[PDB]
């Protein structure tokens, strides 16, 4: 059963959570190929492991930039959580290490690109297509929340499509293990729950709100709350009002009204029946939850695969050389990395 699976999953998690993996590779063991993505602290690059021949995605964080942006604790959270988790829809962290200048997390390379890219290009996904991806997020959040983890950055930009057309959840930069409530203002403007915006303490229910934003965006092709500036987006989120496109089914509309719910005593995922309020909703009635987990369901979309290190499903980025200082920077702050 689910309870039996979750018990054994918590046991494997806590062993790695209590005794994390550290310094499991060297920079000189990889060949840098291309930048797959960027952020304020660095970039994600396609790398090749010299000894195995395998391709990986290596996230590089400049420690000085992490310190300047007050993200030391968030960065330690990311690496500690990632090395400890194991779920079919979470990207696997293969190695981690650090040097004088940077932090490195080497993960399995997902070549099918971001959901964001296919979503913007295509326009919108049909309801069975969006339901397929949403189901995977539901099982992923059920796994993470049972471990007391909050993801806090769900968006199409963070969801990668694998060779079998399944989702690989990426970027644990805002992920946190917290038993009670938390207060950090973080995430993406369009996906923030009203309680984050209103500087109230919040919990795991912000992830279920983010799920509502994701399902709406997948099915409509645009988020439920958009504007040109973040400030205008927050005004829209905190005021009730959500308009659904006329092509949305009654079941979709009903489930979204229960996910995009301001009232925490009424928001799905949070209540007494928990995740089963979502799993058992009528919009998910065709979903075989075990087959989705086992990856036995035929994906509505399989991306083009040219070669193991092909980057055609990703955008091009300005390349910048990796500079490793002769002097160790922020050693005390990133000691446990």
């Amino acid at each position: 059963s689910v309870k039996e699976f979750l018990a054994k999953a918590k046991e494997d998690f806590l062993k790695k959570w209590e005794s994390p993996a550290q310094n499991t590779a060297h920079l000189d063991q990889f060949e840098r190929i291309k930048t797959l993505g960027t952020g304020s602290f660095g970039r994600v690059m396609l790398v090749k492991h010299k000894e195995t021949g395998n391709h990986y995605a290596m996230k590089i964080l400049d420690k000085q930039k992490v310190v300047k942006l007050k993200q030391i604790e968030h960065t330690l959270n990311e690496k500690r959580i990632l090395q400890a988790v194991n779920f079919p829809f979470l990207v696997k962290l293969e190695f981690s290490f650090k040097d004088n200048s940077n932090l490195y997390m080497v993960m399995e390379y997902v070549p099918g690109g971001e959901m964001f890219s296919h979503l913007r290009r295509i326009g919108r996904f049909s309801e069975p297509h969006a339901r397929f991806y949403a189901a995977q997020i539901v099982l992923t959040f059920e796994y993470l929340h049972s471990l007391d983890l909050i993801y806090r950055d769900l968006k199409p930009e963070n969801l990668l499509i694998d060779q079998q057309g399944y989702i690989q959840v990426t970027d644990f930069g805002f992920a946190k293990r917290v038993k009670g409530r938390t207060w950090t203002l973080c995430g993406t403007p369009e996906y923030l729950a009203p309680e984050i915006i209103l500087s109230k303490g919040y919990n795991k229910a912000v992830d279920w709100w983010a799920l509502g934003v994701l399902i709406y965006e997948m099915a409509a092709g645009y988020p439920p709350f958009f504007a040109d500036q973040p400030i205008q987006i927050y005004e829209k989120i905190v005021s009730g009002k959500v308009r659904f496109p006329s092509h949305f089914s009654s079941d979709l509309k009903d489930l979204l009204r229960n996910l995009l719910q301001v009232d925490l005593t009424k928001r799905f995922g949070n209540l007494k029946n928990g995740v089963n309020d979502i799993k058992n909703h009528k919009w998910f009635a065709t979903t075989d939850w075990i087959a989705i987990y086992q990856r036995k369901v035929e994906a509505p979309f399989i991306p083009k695969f040219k070669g193991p290190g092909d980057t055609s499903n990703f955008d091009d980025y300005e390349e910048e050389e990796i500079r490793v200082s002769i002097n160790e920077k922020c050693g005390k702050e990133f000691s446990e990395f």
Binding site: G123, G187, P189, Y222, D228
Partner: peptide
């Protein structure tokens, strides 16, 4: 349309975190 309003907005590209 809402689509046209979205497509014409400055937030159709990759969205940054806060």
């Amino acid at each position: 349309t809402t689509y046209a309003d979205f497509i014409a907005s400055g937030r159709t590209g990759r969205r940054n975190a806060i």
